[PDB]
């Protein structure tokens, strides 16, 4: 059983910190779209 | 029967004593297994 223990079993202190990490590189990923998204409009001033 | 009394029966003192130290190593044993129960609790406090 401890033997089994080794393999199956998840390492709890490092998910949470991969998770967070995730979470965070996701809500980066957010606001980087959301504010690379309207840098074309720039050419609706331009041509006005 | 002097003879065979010391092969049969059992010398009390001893036995007392034995009985007195397996007690006092199953309390032991009762409490650091309640002890090393929660243990897991740590993760829970970890994820949130």
Do not use: C, F
Not at 24 to 32: L, P, R
Request: charged share 15%.
């Amino acid at each position: 059983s401890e033997a089994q223990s080794r393999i199956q079993d998840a390492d709890y202190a490092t998910e949470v910190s991969n998770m967070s990490k995730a979470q965070i590189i996701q809500q980066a990923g957010n606001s980087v779209l959301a504010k690379a998204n309207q840098v074309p409009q720039q050419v609706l001033s331009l041509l006005q």
